[PDB]
Amino acid sequence: GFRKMAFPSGKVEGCMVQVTCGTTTLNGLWLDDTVYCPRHVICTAEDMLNPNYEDLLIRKSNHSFLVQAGNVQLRVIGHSMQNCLLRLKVDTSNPKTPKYKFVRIQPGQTFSVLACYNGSPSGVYQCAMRPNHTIKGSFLNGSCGSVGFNIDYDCVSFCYMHHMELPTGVHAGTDLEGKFYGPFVDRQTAQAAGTDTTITLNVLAWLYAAVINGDRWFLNRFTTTLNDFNLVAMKYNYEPLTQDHVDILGPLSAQTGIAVLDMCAALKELLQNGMNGRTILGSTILEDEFTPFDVVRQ
Amino acid sequence: GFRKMAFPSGKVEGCMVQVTCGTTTLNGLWLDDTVYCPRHVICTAEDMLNPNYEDLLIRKSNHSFLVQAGNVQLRVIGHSMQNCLLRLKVDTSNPKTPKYKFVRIQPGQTFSVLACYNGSPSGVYQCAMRPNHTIKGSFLNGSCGSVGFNIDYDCVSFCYMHHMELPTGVHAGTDLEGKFYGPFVDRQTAQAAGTDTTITLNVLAWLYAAVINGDRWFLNRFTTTLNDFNLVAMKYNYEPLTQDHVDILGPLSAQTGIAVLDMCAALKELLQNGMNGRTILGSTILEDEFTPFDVVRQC
Ligand SMILES: CC(C)(C)[C@H](NC(=O)C(F)(F)F)C(=O)N1C[C@H]2[C@@H]([C@H]1C(=O)N[C@H](C=N)C[C@@H]1CCNC1=O)C2(C)C
Ligand SMILES: CC(C)(C)[C@H](NC(=O)C(F)(F)F)C(=O)N1C[C@H]2[C@@H]([C@H]1C(=O)N[C@H](C=N)C[C@@H]1CCNC1=O)C2(C)C
């Protein structure tokens, strides 16, 4: 009784459309009278080596954008570029527009992804912004324009739009202002991320999830200092723990009766001695894509 | 890049309502002018061992059922009992009703669950119907009436309505005709899941996914017949493979060039010799809720 859960996607499904330029098709996000989509929709195998997007956009008209909201075609009455997105103005305002915000998420935070193909939603899953600013998604051909989001009350916080897959199989994209997460550019050329690390704050939160759910085999009577634990974190490619992070784990610490630095001693033991064929919440690996907030909500 | 993915939940979100009888509230599924919900909504510590549902139902008027679709109350116009569900006729037909059907999901097949509380959807996740007819869900108090479903093209196939949690932490419920999956009853009494077994068709799909992903340390050159693999599998509480299962794995065997029965011989050795601390797709435990359809669609 503890698993990856995505937000219900209906508020986002009502905003998904299909945007086509010539032979290139991807998904767009339709909010009020604006459609947001990745700008490389205007590209045709000049995806490579030299996308000069200013040169390629000046040569386009409104008429060269075919935007389809289901059966209906919306007419583009304007267009501008913002960073790596296009903002297409259309004559119709989406009646299904939810209360929404655009936010830029921090590494370690999680969001739900609505994977779309030809404007049509096909799956929903949870994932996280990695410390190296990639995401470990599931995106196939035609998935560009799919969005990541969180929902607070009735408000959809859009945080990700999908652009590309790196050769390691992880993914890269932008916020809804079109600025990439990480060092990447929307050009079909080989690009690497920085070396990733494990999200220590999330592993600790998931260890609290396990205690809350009856898995306590890994606890122990020892404890450790912050710097003592951080020395072990660095050896195993975990990111350092901050007093602010300890402060974030306060509510989970209270509800379980295990001080943060005690859980760190437990984690230190799991890194050093392995898990010895046992499981935690049904997993044989230390899970790092649940935030403290995700654990409390579940 | 393989991961569990749920169907987009919007088509079901627009059908979720709250149903309240006195002190007990749970979720209902509003399609056209019918609201479907577990019948134990009419109970009040009559839940204990022996609710007499026909007795409790005859003693209830339409006005005792408080049905709320978000902001607005819906008026219950009639009601009947179908197996372990109530069917509430309301005066309003749901304008958001999608194309739908009611299906009986089979052991081994997967579906998405929209977990709801007080008629408000809170999360979506994917589930397998286990061979012992339970599901390994994530349901808290108030989750009853949450539904599981698949979506084909534009049509929602409803297959599950949540009723209860068994002592091992797994969950039981019914199809949308109110017939329970498994030998369970909606009575708060001593009940236990049967012995689970492992969904072998899905473990084999997972090994194929691992081969597609470049991991093939577990392959060997032994051969096995279907019958000799099934005899070993049952010794380890694995489901035996059927004729149809071998056919279902055709696409993945063709894609990888590994004959179905050769992957069976790979699995047979894993069952008999363990993993010896090696990992498959990052895990020392064989996943059995990822279907051959999920592997095929995610490649
Ligand atoms: C994977 C590929 C080698 C093709 C390339 N990657 C690199 O060039 C890199 F090495 F720089 F990453 C790449 O993704 N693109 C090439 C080109 C865009 C993009 C693209 O096709 N986006 C798809 C949108 N529908 C979603 C992708 C497709 C497959 N799975 C996804 O997620 C732009 C960078 C303009
Ligand atoms: C777990 C409990 C000991 C309470 C009991 N279980 C057994 O009696 C068993 F052990 F027999 F299964 C049980 O579930 N119920 C008691 C009673 C219904 C049901 C119930 O409360 N359903 C909840 C619906 N809102 C969802 C559950 C709650 C907690 N987590 C869930 O999923 C009925 C069988 C009429």
Curated annotation (Swiss-Prot), chain B:
Known catalytic reactions: TSAVLQ-|-SGFRK-NH2 and SGVTFQ-|-GKFKK the two peptides corresponding to the two self-cleavage sites of the SARS 3C-like proteinase are the two most reactive peptide substrates. The enzyme exhibits a strong preference for substrates containing Gln at P1 position and Leu at P2 position
Superkingdom as given in the UniProt entry: Viruses
Subcellular locations according to the entry: Host cytoplasm; Host Golgi apparatus
Active site (UniProt): 40 (for 3cl-pro activity), 144 (for 3cl-pro activity)
Topology, Cytoplasmic side: 1-299
Peptidase C30 domain location: 1-299
Subunit record text: Exists as monomer and homodimer. Only the homodimer shows catalytic activity.
Function: Cleaves the C-terminus of replicase polyprotein at 11 sites. Recognizes substrates containing the core sequence [ILMVF]-Q-|-[SGACN]. Also able to bind an ADP-ribose-1''-phosphate (ADRP). May cleave host ATP6V1G1 thereby modifying host vacuoles intracellular pH.
Identification of the protein by name: 3C-like proteinase nsp5
Organism: Severe acute respiratory syndrome coronavirus (SARS-CoV)
Residues of the full protein shown: 3242 to 3540 of 4382
